[PDB]
């Protein structure tokens, strides 16, 4: 319970709720020492939430003593402080969520230009993260969390490091949104920066057709959408997953099937070339003789996708690699 008018501290006046999360909820304030308007994320006065906002707050605050070019593509936090037994996190405000744009289009998607507008931020994002020294996975990378600098314009920042941990700081093995989870969390395997870019393949296709490429109702349903698309795993992952006989069944020669239960696409016959619409005016058909939208320009897309959605952790694009994509020249 906050109330609009609420003072805190001579500094924050409380306008409006923005929006409410696991964690807590986030707030519209004006901050009268800076005059300005920020948002105000309140976590919840548990220690379960208490704990993982703390781990979020030393993961911005990492971030901040950072000044290069590619820090700019993650909100910023201005400070935090405790009050009422609620950690308190103080964000500059940022607009809507990428999920609202495209509720916004009735989930027809936006242009092959804006989306890869949204890759480039969105690569340059995780090639931050990527710095040794901060070694950040976000681990819950998706529409939801990516939000607008402004509604007139197409900057975006990434939020909510509130599942976010350093390499080698793992908490959790169930990690990540379901349609956005990778192969390598399904299988309970050690997880590392390669999850966010797997999140990102899954996200831009998204983005332009309207819809999530892989909507798993469950894990089980969710690791055969995957195969659907991409194909059975290869053996040298599947042999070395603790959950692969949660979804595969390895035989003595032909190495691993999809478990099969009660009555999916044969294996790698959902192509991604069709769900594109590549050679077919794009998602629907509804980009036909739209600039921008040439096979030509499909084909960079979808090569730099499969690139994002590579089965093997250690062979998945990397950030800066993405960066120098075709997708991205000229
Ligand atoms: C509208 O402005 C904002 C700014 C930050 C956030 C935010 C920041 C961090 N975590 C979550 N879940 C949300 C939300 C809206
Ligand atoms: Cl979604
Ligand atoms: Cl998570």
Redesign the pocket.
Known sequence: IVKNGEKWMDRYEIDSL??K?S?GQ?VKAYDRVEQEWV?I?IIKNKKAFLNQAQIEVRLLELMNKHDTEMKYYI?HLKRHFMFRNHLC?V?????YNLYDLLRNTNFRGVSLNLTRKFAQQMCTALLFLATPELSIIHCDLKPE?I?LCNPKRSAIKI????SSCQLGQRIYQYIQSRFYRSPEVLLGMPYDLAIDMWSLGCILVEMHTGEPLFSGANEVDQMNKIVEVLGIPPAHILDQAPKARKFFEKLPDGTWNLKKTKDYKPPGTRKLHNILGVETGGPGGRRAGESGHTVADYLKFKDLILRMLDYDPKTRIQPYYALQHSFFKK
């Not at 964000?91 to 607009?95: C, H, T």
């Open positions: 923005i929006g999360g964690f986030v948002a994320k909100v996190l964000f500059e405000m940022l607009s969390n939000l939020v909510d490091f509130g």
